[PDB]
Symmetry: D2
Subunit: 258 residues, 4 copies
């Protein structure tokens, strides 16, 4: 039995170069979806048809991607908003400049907002489709050292997503959130290695430092990119037709409240 498939579905998945983005692109293709993804620069190995080059942190980039989506897919059945991250330095709330706030909002909130504004009305007119906003456990569990503005932007995204669900769910478009905790990437593995040029070393000890900083991960490990992809594919499928306006956390139990 083929429990789940995405055959025929046209999907825009933002930021599919690496990490969970790449894993989600890869899984969607496995499941039969036609995929368009985005990056500032196309990675050398993958088909030109799969990528549109753009800076989604700018309104010009969003305009380009929305149009490319229309031209390449002809329409969208699934949007997965994966673009996100934080580049702010540490030092707490008072070390955040106007630039930092603008950067955090542009990356984590505005790309989804701008793309949705362009693409969702057509989905509503058709009367079917799914939008997945990838938020972050920091939206409920903020970590202040360098991610105060990151957390705030993800909280804006989460509530924006719920608001949109209230509007478009009655019209047949589902809108869900996926909220990951720590995801194991090349970047994070190197971060774990880094925290070992400082006191300690062992890598495992480095990962422990990171996990303790989150308040501990009951599962004892971060999520793999493929595991985030798994949840997103499930939510985008017809096996999830009654799921909308909800946030599905994938964090190994990190968020410690019920």
């Amino acid at each position: 039995i083929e429990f789940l498939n995405l055959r025929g579905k046209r999907a825009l998945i933002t930021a599919g170069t690496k990490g969970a983005g790449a894993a989600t692109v890869s899984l969607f293709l496995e499941l039969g979806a036609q995929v368009l993804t985005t990056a500032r620069a196309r990675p050398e190995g993958l088909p030109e048809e799969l990528f549109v080059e753009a800076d989604l942190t700018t309104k010009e980039g969003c305009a380009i991607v929305a149009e490319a989506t229309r031209q390449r897919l002809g329409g969208v059945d699934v949007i997965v908003h994966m673009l996100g991250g934080s580049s702010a330095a540490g030092g707490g709330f008072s070390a955040l400049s106007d630039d930092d706030w603008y950067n955090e909002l542009s990356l984590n909130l505005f790309a989804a907002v701008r793309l949705d504004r362009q693409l969702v009305p057509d989905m509503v007119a058709r009367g079917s489709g799914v939008v997945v906003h990838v938020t972050s456990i920091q939206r409920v569990l903020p970590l202040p050292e360098s991610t105060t503005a990151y957390a705030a932007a993800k909280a804006a995204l989460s509530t924006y997503s719920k608001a949109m669900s209230k509007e478009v769910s009655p019209k047949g478009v589902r809108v869900v959130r996926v909220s990951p905790g720590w995801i194991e990437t090349e970047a994070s593995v190197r971060l774990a290695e880094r925290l070992a040029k400082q006191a300690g070393t062992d890598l495992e000890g480095g990962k422990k430092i990171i996990m303790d900083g989150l308040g501990g991960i009951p599962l004892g490990r971060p999520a793999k990119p493929e595991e985030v992809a798994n949840l997103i594919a499930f939510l985008a499928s017809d096996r999830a037709a009654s799921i909308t306006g909800a946030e599905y956390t994938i964090d190994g139990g990190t968020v410690p409240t019920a």
Copy 2:
């Protein structure tokens, strides 16, 4: 590609006679699981090996089922606690007798507690497994007319489940909650028909009365039993290995908060 399967997995699914319980039993069997389910009386059509007869609202019934599980399955990889419901009359909090409170707790909370106490330690010793507590959106969104004690019992279940996840997730047993809104069953369809011997009639109008009572369902319809089964099977599978200590709501958007 076979995205999801449950081959080899041994599953206890409580209360599998009808509704979402029956749909979950049916889906698990489709996906290759060995299933044991429970009811006060076996339905006439289905194999004797599939059912254990017991009253899970009593501690004797729970003792019987735990032992039957050991004898028939030899061990458990997945427990899905589906037993739940409310038999209290209306009249608000002051119309709830001591019997009503006892009944609501015994049905919605104590069966899971008693079974988990017996079965989960062996899963922990093996170092693998999944427990699914089926709660209810009323645990966060209580409706006072007849379901004040029902809501309270489901809230106890939800927090109990989270507590257990904190303890056993580090030992390799995942513990998740599935929180349904209104599920379309034979009982509810007849309820919709009933609210038409009162003012109105149209059935569709009857379902509207029910949905308005919930504060509205953005999706515009209740969940189907098969849709609840879909989510439970996903959570029980290895595609969900990083998901624990979380509650996954399936309610068409009913809960109106982010």
Copy 3:
């Protein structure tokens, strides 16, 4: 200016022998309220008129207190449900017996339920009054070692309280929850001292052990009994006439989610 007073108000405050219970009794008397409080045995120093002797963990005790309230106060304007606690040993969920579950529910949930059932309808008939359910941060942030059933019972209480608020708030009775974190009592100070007959000693070090177990208290200290009383008196006063159906946390920031 006398910002706040409780002159003329008749208050039942359960479990007022010590800790926050005693501090709340004391503050209410300071603010002009007529108070009735409860204990298994009256403390030697305080007026007989102030206390009714009863075991509120039994339905007989609740019946006695409700009647004593009617006889001594003639009516109730404010009920503060402070009775709560946990006597379960450690060992996690599987070490909880049927007795443990019964004890936790009887102490933390059933006394409020039984008393409310008797007393609240008269408040509703008058069309004014306040009920304060003292819950616990464990209702959202459960700690599994010895307090799995305690957390579950407090979650039941919290959702029960919200359900009741939906019913009686439109009739002019406010129903609010106060959710304390760690409260500094004689018992807890001795617990801090105890964890020093084990590794360490310093008392301050003992309090650190406790706080770390909670995941840390940002404020850096537990709440004082008087501080819990402060919040309860505010909520019971006419300065809080628009506050109902809400839970007010007093925990020095312990709960780490927004």
Copy 4:
């Protein structure tokens, strides 16, 4: 007994011209605080020393107010961030322009962020003080017609506030949120009257239309400006010394979840 006072305390209360802002200014002055408040233009009746003229929706305005605070108060013990509102038209998420998003963020989020960045470090250096972020129930309960961006901005504010509390609470500065539902103002009373030039008329009927739009208010009426002021004064006082990192909702029970 003088339960509560704010004598000696120096308070910046933003946006104190009308509504809850004016009521909070008035109450703080009653309780002995030295107050500085803000508006685009000073209302004709009140002392020049009480107001600084500025447009807090701009970074220049925030710079002006922070400096005026330093000159007029010499230091700040309490900041109450009351500035907020929405000017977006209806039409749902797709009717929100880039200007709308910028306006909603600048008004509801950025004024607090910019002021806090300037003023909070000095409070931290002193080791005492309170910051109150006035959010909105829409941060959890978003209403999509015209307030999608408003809700998102208030959610950003709420999580930002929690993040800051984690950082500065250990240093002796408390950071709390007050989350109002509908507040009765001149503007809203006229809105109620307006919805009567449309179908209906009765004013009471107009207020019913508004309340139904919120999903109903169990209390049956909006909060008064003075009632919001009451809660803010309590939270700013030494009677609330153990309350930090929490959000206190004042909405007559509107938010329907526990």
